[PDB]
Amino acid sequence: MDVIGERIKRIKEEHNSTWHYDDENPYKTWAYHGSYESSMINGVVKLLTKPWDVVPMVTQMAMTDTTPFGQQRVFKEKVDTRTPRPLPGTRKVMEITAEWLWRTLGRNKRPRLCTREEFTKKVRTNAASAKAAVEDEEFWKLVDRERELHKLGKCGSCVAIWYMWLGARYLEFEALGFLNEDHWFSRENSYSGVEGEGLHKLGYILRDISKIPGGAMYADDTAGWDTRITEDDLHNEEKIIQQMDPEHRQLANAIFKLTYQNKVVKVQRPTPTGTVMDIISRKDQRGSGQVGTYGLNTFTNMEAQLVRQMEGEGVLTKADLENPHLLEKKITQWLETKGVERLKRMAISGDDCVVKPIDDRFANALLALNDMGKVRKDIPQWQPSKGWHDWQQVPFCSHHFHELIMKDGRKLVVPCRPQDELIGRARISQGAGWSLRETACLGKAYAQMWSLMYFHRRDLRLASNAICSAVPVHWVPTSRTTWSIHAHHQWMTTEDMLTVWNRVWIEENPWMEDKTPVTTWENVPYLGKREDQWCGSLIGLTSRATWAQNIPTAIQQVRSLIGNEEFLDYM
Ligand SMILES: [Zn+2]
Ligand SMILES: [Zn+2]
Numbered sequence: 001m002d003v004i005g006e007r008i009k010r011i012k013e014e015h016n017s018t019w020h021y022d023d024e025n026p027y028k029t030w031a032y033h034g035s036y037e038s039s040m041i042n043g044v045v046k047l048l049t050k051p052w053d054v055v056p057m058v059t060q061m062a063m064t065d066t067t068p069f070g071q072q073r074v075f076k077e078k079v080d081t082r083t084p085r086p087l088p089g090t091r092k093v094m095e096i097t098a099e100w101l102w103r104t105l106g107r108n109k110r111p112r113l114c115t116r117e118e119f120t121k122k123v124r125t126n127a128a129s130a131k132a133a134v135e136d137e138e139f140w141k142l143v144d145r146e147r148e149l150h151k152l153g154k155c156g157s158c159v160a161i162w163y164m165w166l167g168a169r170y171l172e173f174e175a176l177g178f179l180n181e182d183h184w185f186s187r188e189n190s191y192s193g194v195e196g197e198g199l200h201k202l203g204y205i206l207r208d209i210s211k212i213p214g215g216a217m218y219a220d221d222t223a224g225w226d227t228r229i230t231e232d233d234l235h236n237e238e239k240i241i242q243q244m245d246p247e248h249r250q251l252a253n254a255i256f257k258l259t260y261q262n263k264v265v266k267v268q269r270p271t272p273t274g275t276v277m278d279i280i281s282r283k284d285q286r287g288s289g290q291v292g293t294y295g296l297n298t299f300t301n302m303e304a305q306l307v308r309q310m311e312g313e314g315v316l317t318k319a320d321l322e323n324p325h326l327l328e329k330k331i332t333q334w335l336e337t338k339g340v341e342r343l344k345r346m347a348i349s350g351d352d353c354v355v356k357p358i359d360d361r362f363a364n365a366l367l368a369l370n371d372m373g374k375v376r377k378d379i380p381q382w383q384p385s386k387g388w389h390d391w392q393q394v395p396f397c398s399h400h401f402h403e404l405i406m407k408d409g410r411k412l413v414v415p416c417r418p419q420d421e422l423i424g425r426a427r428i429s430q431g432a433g434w435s436l437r438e439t440a441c442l443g444k445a446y447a448q449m450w451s452l453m454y455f456h457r458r459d460l461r462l463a464s465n466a467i468c469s470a471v472p473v474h475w476v477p478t479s480r481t482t483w484s485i486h487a488h489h490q491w492m493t494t495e496d497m498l499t500v501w502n503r504v505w506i507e508e509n510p511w512m513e514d515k516t517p518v519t520t521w522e523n524v525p526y527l528g529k530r531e532d533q534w535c536g537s538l539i540g541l542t543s544r545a546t547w548a549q550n551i552p553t554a555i556q557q558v559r560s561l562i563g564n565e566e567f568l569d570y571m
Contacts, residue, residue: 003257004281006149006156007264008033011279022278026269029082030280035269037276039064042429043436044443047554048466051543052423061424072270079227083284083373088324090307090371091232093316093331097303098236100335102243104191104343105184105299111244113251114177116140119170128180128291128485133163143167147174150254158259159266172259172291175252179295191343192302195294199453199486200504203401203413204511205347206354206391212345215360216387217394221377225297225351226286228373234261234284236303237296263287294485297350302343305355308369309342310334312362321367347396349486354396363387397486404456404525410514412505412525414456419536422450422460430479436562438478443467445477448491452501456527458539465570466551468497470558472565498524 012019015036025032041062052058064070086094123134133139142163149156150171158168179185185193187205194205210217222228238256241249261283268277286293310316315334320326347354355362363384370381379385388394392402398421404412426446429439447467450460477492490500498521506512518524526532529539538544552571559567 001262001281003153003155004262004264006154007159008279010156011036011159011266022271022276024271025278026076026080027278027280028080030080030282032278032280035276035278037274038066038432040429040432040434042427042439042443044440044470044558045426045446045463045467047558048443048470048551049423049427049463050554051538051541051547052420052427055420055423057418057420058424058427061421061428069270072268075267076269078224079285081227083228083230086230086232086371086373087321089319089321089326090368092323092326092328093307093310093320093368094232094236094303094372096328096331097306097335098239098299100332100339101299101303101306102239104339105189106240106243109182109184109189111178111240111248112182113248114174114181116143116170118177118181119173126480128483130162130166133166139163139167143170147171147251150258151250153254153257155254155258159264168259169289169291171251172255175248175255176292176295179292185295185298190298190302190348191340192305192346192348193298194347194349195298195485197486198488199397199399199415199484200488200509202347202397202399202486203403203415206394206396206401207403207413209345209347209354209356210391212356214345214356214358215362216389217354217356217391218362218385218387219352219354219394219396220379220385222351222374223377225374226288226293228375229284229286229297229300230373231261231284233300233373237299259290294350298348301348301351301353302346304369304372304374305346305348305353306335306339306342307372308365309345309355309357309362311365311368312357312359314361316368318367321371349397352397354394360387397484402456402527402531404527406525407523408516410512412456413511415453416457416527416535419457419459419538422454422457423463426450426481437475440471440558440562441475441478442481444471444475445479445481445491447471448477448493448497449481451497452491452504455501455521455524456532457535457537458526458529458532459537459544461521461526462548462551466555469568469570470555470562471567472562473568474566 012034018036019034020036021034025035046053120134123130146156146158146167157164158171159165180195183189183196185195187193187197194202197205234256241252241256244252262281264279264281265287266277266279268275286297307316310331315330345356366382366384369376375381376385392400394400399415399417402414402416404414406412426443429442444467447464450457450464454460474494476494480489481487481491490504493500498518501524502517506515506518527535532539
């Protein structure tokens with residue numbers, strides 16, 4: 001590759017004091033040119049969740065393997081592998097579907113550049129430490145310089161000096177940020193997308209899909225989705241440039257060509273001498289850390305599922321996939337007549353998908369899915385997918401969903417996951433060197449999230465009150481509970497939680513017809529005991545009963561360690 005030398009010659013330039021090329025490199029498809037050369041437990045939450053001191057899943061999450069072994073062997077194992085090129089017929093159909101999809105996605109919207117001001121706003125609020133750069137003119141000078149490089153068809157630093165990484169990310173956000181900021185994959189615009197809907201809506205969306213007449217609901221994982229993105233996928237995602245103004249088109253074509261279709265990655269290797277870092281390149285796959293990775297994964301997944309549905313419906317044959325002169329017409333006619341309707345049968349979030357086809361031939365439509373490189377996880381290539389007849393069974397975005405019948409007769413659809421995962425996560429604190437205060441506040445953060453998202457789990461509501469009772473009323477929850485793009489962080493507030501519960505689940509809930517306020521937590525429903533239990537609850541156990549009865553004691557213990565602040569009783 002010619003158009004790659006600049007970044008190869010730059011890291012060579014600074015790191016010449018240790019530079020060489022190793023003959024013992026574990027890179028068999030990642031082309032190689034050279035190489036050079038801590039997270040505690042939340043004490044508050046733990047104290048109030050004693051019965052979970054034992055639980056294996058809880059213990060497992062309280063273990064972090066990040067530095068010495070856990071990313072040198074993990075982020076390297078099944079990544080340096082190839083994907084066979086899709087057949088020519090497959091390639092044609094994909095190309096038509098991508099053309100049609102971009103056109104559809106852009107029917108009401110025009111692509112535009114995002115701005116320094118927009119990027120500043122987002123960095124300040126924490127979204128999707130780096131502040132120093134953002135209030136620094138020099139940073140924007142470096143940004144401007146690399147932009148002039150991109151404009152000329154060249155790339156310098158898109159791989160303190162932390163300014164280059166962020167710089168790269170901004171330019172990316174500048175050329176492709178519109179996909180998120182202008183909501184291209186919101187349900188209203190994308191039909192299959194759920195971007196910006198929020199976790200508290202995902203269940204309602206699944207239930208609406210369940211009402212569409214058809215076969216079962218399918219939700220196959222892809223084994224390492226990002227590793228499965230082909231050169232062909234990348235070229236189809238690029239078709240979005242056609243809709244851009246000349247000035248935007250340049251900057252975008254730069255991003256795709258230089259950082260998507262021709263990447264330069266830095267990664268460490270355990271060379272038995274010292275801590276070394278390798279520099280490698282590849283024409284395909286996806287790098288997670290990129291702004292707009294989500295947009296393009298949602299896009300390619302949407303396309304992929306449309307192709308599977310097409311095969312399911314008999315539009316695509318093995319013969320069609322092999323045909324280097326496959327005719328466009330039947331795909332075009334399928335897309336133009338049935339395209340949108342088939343998108344309405346789907347919920348897609350990056351590599352997460354749920355699909356409800358018109359019948360169950362879909363279960364066996366595997367030719368194209370396999371040939372496209374999107375091989376399902378933990379299943380023989382050619383075994384039909386398991387479908388679910390109950391939408392409540394369907395996994396999506398680490399959750400499943402339940403319908404609840406409130407005492408007043410109304411219904412809620414609520415997010416849920418095995419309780420140990422919830423408690424295990426709350427019991428962890430990201431990073432060492434925290435005071436009790438910052439620790440108490442992260443707990444409250446989790447506690448209030450549980451009262452808005454998982455209030456229907458008996459144990460988590462009790463733990464929730466316990467935490468809120470032990471932490472001063474006026475202390476503001478800080479630091480996030482999750483990085484999920486589906487989280488709207490309504491729990492990050494000193495506003496009383498039943499007021500917020502009412503805003504989220506009654507007032508602003510478009511699926512709630514009757515707007516009558518809930519005046520007490522006693523009218524906020526639980527999962528049935530039975531379901532609560534199958535989802536991990538400890539209700540019924542005596543250790544849980546003891547903890548419940550003896551919770552006031554531990555609350556007081558936490559209280560006297562915090563000091564003579566203002567407390568409220570939530571039990
Ligand atoms: Zn660059
Ligand atoms: Zn559940």
